[PDB]
Amino acid sequence: GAKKSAIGQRIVATLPYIKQEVPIIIVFRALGFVSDRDILEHIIYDFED
Amino acid sequence: QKRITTPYMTKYERARVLGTRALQIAMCAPVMVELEGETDPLLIAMKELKARKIPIIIRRYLPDGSYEDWGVDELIISD
Amino acid sequence: KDILCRLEHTTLRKVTANTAIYYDPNPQSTVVAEDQEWVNVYYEMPDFDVARISPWLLRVELDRKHMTDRKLTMEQIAEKINAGFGDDLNCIFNDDNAEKLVLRIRIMNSDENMDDDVFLRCIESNMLTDMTLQGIEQISKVYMHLPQTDNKKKIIITEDGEFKALQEWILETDGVSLMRVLSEKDVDPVRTTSNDIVEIFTVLGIEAVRKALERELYHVISFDGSYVNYRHLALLCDTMTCRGHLMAITRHGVNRQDTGPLMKCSFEETVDVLMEA
Amino acid sequence: KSMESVMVKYDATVRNSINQVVQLRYGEDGLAGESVEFQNLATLKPSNKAFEKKFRFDYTNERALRRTLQEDLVKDVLSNAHIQNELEREFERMREDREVLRVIFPTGDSKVVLPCNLLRMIWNAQKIFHINPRLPSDLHPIKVVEGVKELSKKLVIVNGDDPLSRQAQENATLLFNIHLRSTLCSRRMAEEFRLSGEAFDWLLGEIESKFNQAIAHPGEMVGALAAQSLGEPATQMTLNT
Amino acid sequence: DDEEETYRLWKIRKTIMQLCHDRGYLVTQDELDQTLEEFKAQFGDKPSEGRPRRTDLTVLVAHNDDPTDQMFVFFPEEPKVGIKTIKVYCQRMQEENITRALIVVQQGMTPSAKQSLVDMAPKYILEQFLQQELLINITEHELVPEHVVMTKEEVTELLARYKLRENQLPRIQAGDPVARYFGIKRGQVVKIIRPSETAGRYITYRLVQ
């Protein structure tokens, strides 16, 4: 889908005992760090790139 | 003649006739051609085929089912 | 080389050096300074501005070296992108003399009087992925080489009658697109052949596959240096094409046959066939 | 397993177990695979001018003919226009056959598979009859031409009273007949072989007996042989090329 | 390019002239050797803003064997022929009063149009063809062998001599292009001639099913 291509590829993460793959943002929120900046710092140590 | 089937004996026909003649000799068939001091039925059978004195007629089956009858003398040895 | 470029597939992403989005309410606003000089000549004659002016601007930069390699001109690309999109996309181009190649795109003004932001992004992404600017989609790349072998070289009969072999440049294309390549002009249909047996069946016909299969059997056996008589090769293709359709030598192919139920019983489908019989 | 059913019938038509015909003749030649041997046509490969000079057999010079023929034979050839016409006819027919060969093969390679090799037998005949190259041939030229025609008539792959069955045999023996005409051409026989008339007659008899042996015997299972034969090369082929 | 499309139309017409010739319909010698320049002058330089409108390219040919038998080919401006447009072609065929007819399709004909074609199987038959396929000739290709039409009496002679049933002769599918190009009637036998290295020539018989 062109709309899906425009947003970009989604990094869904497989986990044990899950019916369908769970997106990284959702699993990160479940761990904690609800703020978007907190999720971003774990995913990318440097935001320069 | 007017027969599609070859007048010459086929190699498969030659093998069966030689086996049959040898089988008859071991059983105790009267010899059309006298053996040259041979106790081996196969050796006598080959000499009998060269003589063409064997009393065998071969029926050839066509696809339509027509039958061609060839005497051993009429047939020509493949070898 | 020019025919090879026509055969080789090309897309918008390859030709464009980079693609960017800028906000320009008016051509006079000139958020980007460099485009203003060519834009100012465009500004003197307004086009499509009567209904409205587009706030969002799509700016495309094309590398000259990429255009030269594909023998593609920005003006021809602009007209083709406009075609089939109606007035939804409007494209303006730099003068050919100017070293930089820039395409400025404004969204249709009629709708103003899908979120315009993501719509511009969607049009830019969709065009880049599916541009199909030149070449055949089936063949990713075309390679040009000259063959030493006499059989590959063109063979003609001279007035003297001695056979003559003339080397001709030949093209090898990834994937199979026999029908499209033959359709293209300046291509010899008789000489061109496709490795895929199914491609031969679809265009050339079943008997052509039978000749090709015998040639393929000879070619593979010759490669290892073994020799097999023509009679054995001819029989294998003839039995395969006897049905008139391509059939693989597989259990399923044997299962569809005019053979009797006992043969099927020997083939491990005995329970179903015997009940049916 | 797939090809075991295919076999040759009494009529020599290859057929499946269902009896649907796979080939009208085995190998498209109706001859045994072992019998055919590689031979060179030597007609398509030479240039047209070279071919015309080689088979011209011109009687105009009357000195080249004198070298290759006995004095009584050459004077008889000059005396009768019909004898000269027959020598011209074989060359013209050979040219038509050579054009047919060019149509059959675009490459026009001399190498072909044919049942009987005339050259090997001719070399054996020269040793057996102690033929001398210096001595001119004692065989009249028309007799050589007639002998080739008689041998072609004697050998029939397919015998049918109805039309198109006789034509099928001509197609089967077409390659062999063209090779037979070129090898047994009267100009070639007189120029190099100088074969005696008895030796040529012996050669014609030898070819006929070998050709009859060459024809494949009916009832052979061609499919079972073909499938096993392909397997031996497959083992030689490397797993990854 | 409009000019390249005119070049494609010339290739389709030249192949159509060869296709009727394979059937046995009489064909003009000039049409068989027609050149692109002659076609472009005769029908107009380009379809867009030009004399060609995907119309007037229709060809009527009369069979050499039967003068009354004729083949008419229809060209559609639409890429897929409309169900209504084929009915208009059938009305034109009714005026022609010829059972044999041919249709050339720029793209793929609609399935509903195919359903209309199948019901009228006995008379006014139409043979569907693809314009892209007609750009090239299958017969010219070296891999394709020579195909010879055989009369029913000739078919009987081969079967009688070798005692073969029509089923025994290797079958050729109707779907493959060579069978459609020749337009051999189903159940007829077409002779195939292929050169064989062992014999120098070979003859085989194919039964269309």
Nearest to D219 among B4, B8, B10 (CB): B10
Residue E69 contacts residue E92 (beta carbons within 8 Å)? no
Beta carbons of C121 and A6 less than 8 Å apart: yes
Name the minimum distance, in Å, from the CA of D159 to any CA of chain B: 7
Give the side-chain half-sphere CA count within 13 A for E107.
8
Instruction: Please list the residues that pair with D14 across neighbouring strands.
Output: D8, D23
D79 touches chain B (CB under 8 A): no
Tokens 């010879």 correspond to E148
Q: What length is written for chain B? A: 79
Q: What are the backbone angles phi and psi of residue D88, rounded to the nearest 5°?
A: -65, -40
Among chain E residues, CA nearest to D27: E198
Beta carbons of E143 and C200 less than 8 Å apart: yes
Q: Which residues contact D71 (CB under 8 A, 6 or more apart)?
A: none
Residue D214 contacts residue C220 (beta carbons within 8 Å)? no
E160 touches chain B (CB under 8 A): no
Beta carbons of D29 and E196 less than 8 Å apart: yes
Q: Which of E136, E153, E174 is the last residue of a domain?
A: E136
Instruction: Say yes or no: E112 and E27 in one domain.
Output: yes
> Nearest-5° angle of CA E129, CA E130, CA E135?
115
Neighbouring C-beta atoms of residue D217, cutoff 10 Å: 19
Q: By C-alpha distance, which of E205, E122, E135, E193 is closest to E169?
A: E205
Neighbouring C-beta atoms of residue E53, cutoff 10 Å: 13
Chosen for mutation from B2, B3, B64 (greatest number of chain E CBs closer than 10 Å) is B64
Give the side-chain half-sphere CA count within 13 A for D192.
9
Q: By C-alpha distance, which of D93, D117, D91, D109 is closest to D46?
A: D109
* CA D150 – CA D129 distance, rounded (Å): 22
Q: How many domains does chain E divide into?
A: 2
CA A40 to chain centre: 9
Tokens 């596959």 correspond to C209
Elucidated via:
cryo-EM
Q: Which domain holds residue B59?
A: 1-79
Q: How is residue B52 written in tokens?
A: 């063409």
Q: Which domain holds residue E21?
A: 1-136
What is the CATH number for B62? 3.90.940.10
Instruction: Say yes or no: E118 and E163 in one domain.
Output: no
- Our CA dihedral for C263, C265, C267, C270, rounded to 10 degrees, sits at 150
Coil/strand/helix, residue E171: strand
Beta carbons of D10 and B4 less than 8 Å apart: yes
* CA D112 – CA D175 distance, rounded (Å): 9
Q: By C-alpha distance, which of D220, E63, D215 is closest to C235?
A: D220
CA E19 to chain centre: 5
Residue C62 contacts residue C118 (beta carbons within 8 Å)? no
Tokens 């004909």 correspond to E109
* CA D162 – CA D168 distance, rounded (Å): 11
* CA E29 – CA E42 distance, rounded (Å): 16
Q: Which of E85, E117, E136 is the last residue of a domain?
A: E136
Cα dist from C255 to C265, C272, C273, E168, E170, whole Å: 10, 12, 10, 20, 19
Coil/strand/helix, residue D179: helix
Per-residue buried b or exposed e for C134-155, using 16+ beta carbons within 10 Å of the residue's own CB: bbbeebeebeeeeeeeeeebee
* CA B56 – CA B75 distance, rounded (Å): 10
Residue E26 contacts residue E70 (beta carbons within 8 Å)? no
Resolution, in Å, please? 4.1
> What angle do the packed helices D222-236 and C206-224 form, to 10 degrees?
50
Provide, as residue numbers in chain C, all residues whose Cβ is less than 8 Å from the Cβ of E137: 189
Per-residue buried b or exposed e for B50-78, using 16+ beta carbons within 10 Å of the residue's own CB: eeeebebebebeebeeeebebebeebebb
- Cβ-based contacts under 8 A for chains B and D: 30
C262 touches chain D (CB under 8 A): no
* CA E20 – CA E102 distance, rounded (Å): 10
Give chain B as a 3 state SS string. Answer: CCCCCCCECCHHHHHHHHHHHHHHHHHCCCCCCCCCCCCCHHHHHHHHHHHCCCCCEEEEECCCCCEEEEECCCCECCC
| Kind of pairing between the strands at D21-23 and D37-40 | unpaired
> What angle do the packed helices D197-214 and D118-129 form, to 10 degrees?
140
Coil/strand/helix, residue D62: coil
Instruction: Say yes or no: E165 and E130 in one domain.
Output: no
Instruction: Say yes or no: E96 and E173 in one domain.
Output: no
Q: Which amino acid, D197?
A: G
Instruction: Please list the residues that pair with C165 across neighbouring strands.
Output: C155
E166 touches chain C (CB under 8 A): no
Residue E23 contacts residue E182 (beta carbons within 8 Å)? yes
What is the CATH number for E26? 3.40.1340.10
DSSP string, C106-163: EE-HHHH---HHHHHHHHHHHHHHH---BS-SS-S-EEEE---STTTSEEEE-SS--E
Nearest to C207 among E8, E178, E197 (CB): E178
Provide, as residue numbers in chain B, all residues whose Cβ is less than 8 Å from the Cβ of D159: 4
Instruction: Say yes or no: E91 and E173 in one domain.
Output: no
What is the CATH number for E205? 3.90.940.20
Q: Which amino acid, D42?
A: A
* CA C66 – CA D127 distance, rounded (Å): 76
Among chain D residues, CA nearest to B62: D10
Decide: E and B in contact? Rule: 3+ Cβ pairs under 8 Å.
Answer: yes
C242 touches chain D (CB under 8 A): yes
Provide, as residue numbers in chain A, all residues whose Cβ is less than 8 Å from the Cβ of C129: 2, 5
Beta carbons of E161 and D165 less than 8 Å apart: yes
Tokens 């076609």 correspond to E39
Tokens 């459609």 correspond to E180
Instruction: Say yes or no: E91 and E7 in one domain.
Output: yes
C234 touches chain D (CB under 8 A): yes
| Kind of pairing between the strands at C102-107 and D21-23 | unpaired
Provide, as residue numbers in chain E, all residues whose Cβ is less than 8 Å from the Cβ of B62: 163
Q: How is residue C135 written in tokens?
A: 């070449």
Q: By C-alpha distance, which of C140, C131, C214 is closest to C176?
A: C140
Q: Which residues contact C226 (CB under 8 A, 6 or more apart)?
A: D232, D233, D236
Instruction: Say yes or no: E164 and E116 in one domain.
Output: no
Q: Which of E93, E111, E136 is the last residue of a domain?
A: E136
Instruction: Say yes or no: E120 and E153 in one domain.
Output: no
* CA C18 – CA C254 distance, rounded (Å): 57
Residue E201 contacts residue D104 (beta carbons within 8 Å)? yes
Q: By C-alpha distance, which of C245, C231, C239, C212 is closest to D1?
A: C239
* CA C159 – CA B77 distance, rounded (Å): 52
* CA C212 – CA D52 distance, rounded (Å): 36
Cα dist from E3 to B57, C135, E8, whole Å: 78, 18, 9
* CA E20 – CA E29 distance, rounded (Å): 13
Q: Which helix (H) or strand (E) holds D65?
A: helix D64-68
Coil/strand/helix, residue D153: helix
Question: Euclidean distance between the first and final Cα of chain D, in Å?
Answer: 28
D61 touches chain B (CB under 8 A): no
Give the side-chain half-sphere CA count within 13 A for D134.
0
Q: How is residue B59 written in tokens?
A: 């029926």
Q: By C-alpha distance, which of D147, D205, D226 is closest to D180?
A: D147
Q: What length is written for chain A? A: 49
Q: How many domains does chain B divide into?
A: 1
Q: Which residues contact C68 (CB under 8 A, 6 or more apart)?
A: none
Q: What sections of chain C are H helices per DSSP?
A: 2-7, 12-15, 36-44, 64-70, 74-82, 109-112, 116-130, 178-183, 197-203, 206-224, 230-242, 251-255, 261-264, 270-276
* CA C264 – CA B4 distance, rounded (Å): 35
* CA C42 – CA E60 distance, rounded (Å): 55
Give the side-chain half-sphere CA count within 13 A for B19.
6
| Kind of pairing between the strands at E100-105 and D14-15 | unpaired
Question: Euclidean distance between the first and final Cα of chain C, in Å?
Answer: 64
Instruction: Say yes or no: E62 and E74 in one domain.
Output: yes
Q: Which amino acid, D236?
A: Q
Instruction: Say yes or no: E11 and E112 in one domain.
Output: yes
| Kind of pairing between the strands at E100-105 and E125-130 | parallel
* CA C221 – CA D234 distance, rounded (Å): 7
